[PDB]
Design a protein around this ligand. Structure first.
Ligand code: AR6
Ligand code: AR6
Ligand code: AGS
Lengths: 398, 83, 185, 398
């Protein structure tokens, strides 16, 4: 269940390939929504499989009246939830413009009910979302090891790792504030925090292994636009108090040009400028010599990311590694006239005369918590907890 | 508070000529002495063992020479094995 | 307040295997020294010097001399042991794997350390016998123990007209003068 | 006996650990009151006993009327005196201000009684306090070896030693004047001394010179304030006359806001400036890499030193050595759920798995004289007095 170059491999000859890959000039990682189900998250099926259940009286307008979703997809639970929100956001602006008072209050309900199932699921904890020191817990234990291993496996002079993701949750920031690591994300300031797209070109140094880079392709819960025209970041406690305790526990959606998740308001020239600058950097990191990319958690149901990856194998120095835990069923289904675009796409490159590609399956053998353990610790790295027995002796001195 | 190791260094490699290894030391007693959670350890004269990081392995070596070039100091060593 | 009452003549500048390389100071600092016991020098490839190392003192023998090319003079040496304290005195141990550190200072040896390098134990001191004096310096007397020397067999070798019959009479008479209940044939 | 890492240790390996610790970048010693018992001093229990044996009629007000002392601690002789004197200075300062003519007199004859008893114990020689060459005697013979061995075991280029202490006697200066060594203590001048806190950063050099640093944490018997803005230092013959004689002999004699021992008048802003710049420097010293500390005479009853020591132990390059004569008689009290905070603190250290800690507790083997014999002389050091036999003839000549 490990296919390189079209044919098979074994565990050791692949665990020895991983180690040689992590030692290249440029190293990166792409994550998805299936990586945060071991911490309190939910995939994209379970969201529609619950919207359907809780709001049936709205599921008829979308199909019989406005034609925004199809019946077989809704029954097989195969809908894209970002494009639906974008289209429903664009249907409301026209009505607000040309003064139609029915089609304006018919969409507020739809949008309020859609922005209420994805938020409740992106809170990995619950009412402890507003509190402090949340990366100290047990669910965020492998996220730490990922960063530790990605940083400690570099040499002096070699660049720093990169991280891309599609989630809009706070699981890698909580887990880095604890280690003592600093992540660049484009924003600067504390009392008025703003987006400057050149802070990705900076780095630290001492004057007497500190930092990394993070790219969020679909936004976050802490990003918003005010009565001004500028994007602002804030903390979780402040967001809970402004615009997150009303979404759930009320029925309010009148700020229709205000939120920046999950990829909704891309018709404004000020909010699309922040989405573009992330794909423009993905497609520029993925085009360098001596590059390696690990993928995990991602279902290949996006046309542009595939059209961007496929076009990078034309350079002989780019290598890929993929984890897909439902590979058997896909081969079966596309053996005899069937399957969806994702399965066809992955099977297309599973059969190739390309040693640059490597696919991994096996259900629980392709999950996040196994991806991590396949990565090496150095031999001179501190692991034994030899400082914790001593921080409570200072507390006993009450 | 993130640290890549707990035992500190003694110098850096600047040359390989066949089997030989060439080392340049840091300035001060930081290039001779050390102190860690377990005790005190030294490297003083020919006939002593030294180690190098290589990621997944640690290379072991024996010293042969030492000399001047405050002034700068050098070392020569040969390889024994790895852990 | 003083740390020492014996001055230096050079400093270590190299360690290449079992060898030691030493650069000297300019002038008669490099050849002579005066202290509370007399005058001491280091002047040719047969002499003994020492190196300070805090807890021990390394002892070495000279082998070469030269100008590198006022000019600068070098020296080369080998190691033969080290000295240390026991209770309120000192003791000499012979083992040759130790060496001094870079920058350490070289110092000459006196008639108080030579008389520890060329001495016998305390257990054997009341059973000793005098034979002579050291040749190069002539400030140190030589003793040997009757037990060690005679419990086993002994050999005396030498050509004609060089002093071989004085030695046997000296020895046989000094054994009697000290142990008058002996038996000699 | 000797415990290192929770495991027993022997004498010839201890004597080689000491010699390896005495060769690091930073070396220091912290002394206490027991260290001056062979020279003519006493502890705090013997002071409290004498107080309660000679002034039993003031031992009732302090307990039943103002509540400064407790009966259980008075009975078991566990009182802190340098902490009871500051409160009694505060009471008098408040009474003067609010014009209570009756309560101002009682706190004026409590402090005289306290100062007489705490001052008689710190002369160490009696009426020969106002004389010259008091370090030639025999009681100050082990205080010289400490300094000699701390200086001799350094190398050229290395820093110089530091001595912290809580005493306020004059036993480490008398011994250095008779040995030819310069101590830095933060004072300058002859005809008018005063505190400059920036000459702890100076040193000597020759042209064609041996020194050390001394930090007193509770004051000294020769420091005093007269004007509004400056503390002054003075010699023993000049102090005996002015103020140290009337204190002993007269019956009621007290000047307020005048003396700088022991930790008394910290409510001003010129005296606390002297007490703070010593703890700041202690903290700074105990936080550098390659640091070694010896402790002797200190009973571990100071919460503000406990945690400095505990928290300087998170750094891998800090080693400490402790001497405690009463370890056995205290390991039991806390197995039986009893004991005082000092006993608990020291057993917490004795029973941890750290190799940076060492405890010596064999009774008269954990005393000041044995400490000084555990340290080494070098081989080339001149160790005998060849010169006094020659200094008599020059006198005889007459
Ligand atoms: N514990 C686990 N560990 C690892 N992988 C898992 C786990 N559980 C499930 N999976 C895998 O995780 C996968 C879940 O796939 P989905 O969440 O639908 O897709 P997305 O996260 O890319 O959705 C975001 C996209 O939506 C828009 O279309 C945009 O294009 C975005 O790209 C499955 O293949 C599971 O096998
Ligand atoms: N001859 C001796 N040699 C060595 N140690 C001795 C000797 N005799 C007794 N001891 C030990 O010496 C110790 C005496 O302890 P104490 O005098 O009470 O404490 P301190 O001098 O630090 O008091 C000042 C502190 O008091 C406040 O708490 C402030 O925080 C001050 O810092 C005992 O453990 C004896 O075993
Ligand atoms: N320490 C000394 N210094 C100078 N001359 C010495 C010394 N010891 C002995 N001699 C002289 O050496 C001379 C000859 O020594 P001999 O006793 O003849 O030795 P030998 O000839 O080997 O002994 P044989 O085999 O019995 S002839 C004597 O005249 C001594 O005076």
């Amino acid at each position: 269940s490990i296919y390189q170059g079209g044919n098979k491999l074994n565990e050791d000859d692949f665990r020895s390939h991983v180690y040689s890959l992590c030692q290249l000039d440029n190293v990166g990682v792409l994550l998805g929504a299936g990586a945060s189900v071991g911490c309190g998250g939910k995939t994209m099926k379970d969201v529609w499989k619950s919207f359907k259940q809780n709001y049936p009286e709205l599921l008829g307008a979308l199909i019989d009246k406005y034609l925004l979703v199809s019946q077989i997809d809704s029954d097989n639970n195969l809908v894209n939830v970002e494009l639906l929100i974008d289209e429903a956001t664009k249907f409301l602006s026209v009505a607000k413009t040309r003064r139609c008072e029915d089609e304006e209050e018919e969409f507020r309900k739809i949008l309020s009910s859609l922005y209420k199932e994805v938020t409740k699921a992106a809170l990995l904890t619950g009412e402890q979302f507003r509190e402090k020191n949340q990366g100290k817990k047990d669910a965020f234990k492998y996220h730490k090891e990922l960063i530790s291993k990605l940083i400690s496996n570099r040499q002096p002079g070699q660049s720093a790792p990169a991280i891309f993701t599609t989630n809009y949750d706070l699981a890698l920031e909580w887990a880095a504030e604890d280690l003592g690591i600093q992540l660049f994300n484009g924003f600067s300031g504390l009392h008025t925090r703003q987006f400057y797209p050149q802070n990705f070109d900076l780095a630290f140094r001492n004057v007497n292994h500190y930092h990394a880079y993070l790219y969020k392709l679909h936004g976050s819960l802490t990003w918003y636009q005010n009565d001004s025209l500028t994007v602002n970041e804030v903390s979780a406690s402040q967001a809970y108090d402004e615009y997150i305790n009303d979404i759930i526990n009320k029925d309010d959606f009148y700020r229709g040009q205000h939120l920046i998740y999950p990829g909704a308001n891309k018709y404004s020239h000020t909010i699309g400028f922040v989405y573009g600058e992330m794909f423009r950097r993905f497609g520029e990191f993925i085009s360098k010599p001596q590059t390696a990319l690990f993928i995990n958690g991602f279902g290949f149901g996006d046309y542009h990311i595939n059209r961007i990856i496929l076009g990078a194998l034309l350079n002989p120095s780019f290598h890929v590694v993929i984890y897909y835990p439902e590979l058997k069923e896909a081969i079966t289904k596309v053996s005899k006239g069937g399957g969806s675009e994702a399965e066809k796409a992955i099977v297309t490159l599973k059969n190739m005369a390309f040693n640059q590609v490597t696919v991994v399956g096996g259900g629980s053998k392709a999950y996040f918590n196994s991806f991590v353990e396949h990565l090496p610790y150095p031999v001179l790295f501190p692991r034994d907890n030899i400082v914790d027995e001593l921080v409570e002796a200072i507390a006993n001195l009450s | 508070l993130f640290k890549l190791t707990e035992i500190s260094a003694i110098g850096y490699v600047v040359g390989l000529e066949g089997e030989r290894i060439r080392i340049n030391l840091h300035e001060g007693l930081q290039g001779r002495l050390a102190s860690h959670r377990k005790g005190v350890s030294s490297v003083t004269q020919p006939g002593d063992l030294i180690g190098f990081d290589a990621g997944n392995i640690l290379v072991v070596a024996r010293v042969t020479d030492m000399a001047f070039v405050i002034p700068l100091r050098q070392i020569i060593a040969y390889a024994i094995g790895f852990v | 307040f003083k740390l020492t009452e014996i001055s230096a003549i050079g400093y270590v500048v190299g360690l290449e295997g079992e060898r030691i390389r030493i650069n000297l100071h300019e002038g008669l600092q490099g050849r002579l020294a005066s202290h509370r016991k007399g005058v001491s020098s280091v002047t040719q490839p047969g002499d003994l010097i020492g190196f300070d190392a805090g807890n021990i003192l390394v002892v070495a023998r000279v082998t070469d001399m030269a100008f590198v090319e006022i000019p600068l003079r070098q020296i080369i040496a080998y190691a033969i042991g080290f000295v240390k304290r026991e209770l309120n005195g000192y003791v000499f141990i012979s083992e040759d794997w130790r060496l001094p550190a870079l920058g350490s200072s070289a110092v000459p040896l006196t008639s108080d350390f030579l008389n520890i390098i060329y001495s016998i134990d305390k257990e054997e001191l009341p059973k000793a016998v005098e034979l002579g004096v050291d040749s190069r310096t002539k400030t140190v007397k030589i003793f040997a123990s009757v037990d060690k020397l005679l419990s086993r067999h002994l050999a005396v070798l030498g050509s004609t007209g060089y002093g071989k019959s004085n030695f046997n009479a000296l020895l046989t008479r000094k054994v009697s003068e000290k142990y008058p209940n002996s038996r000699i044939v």
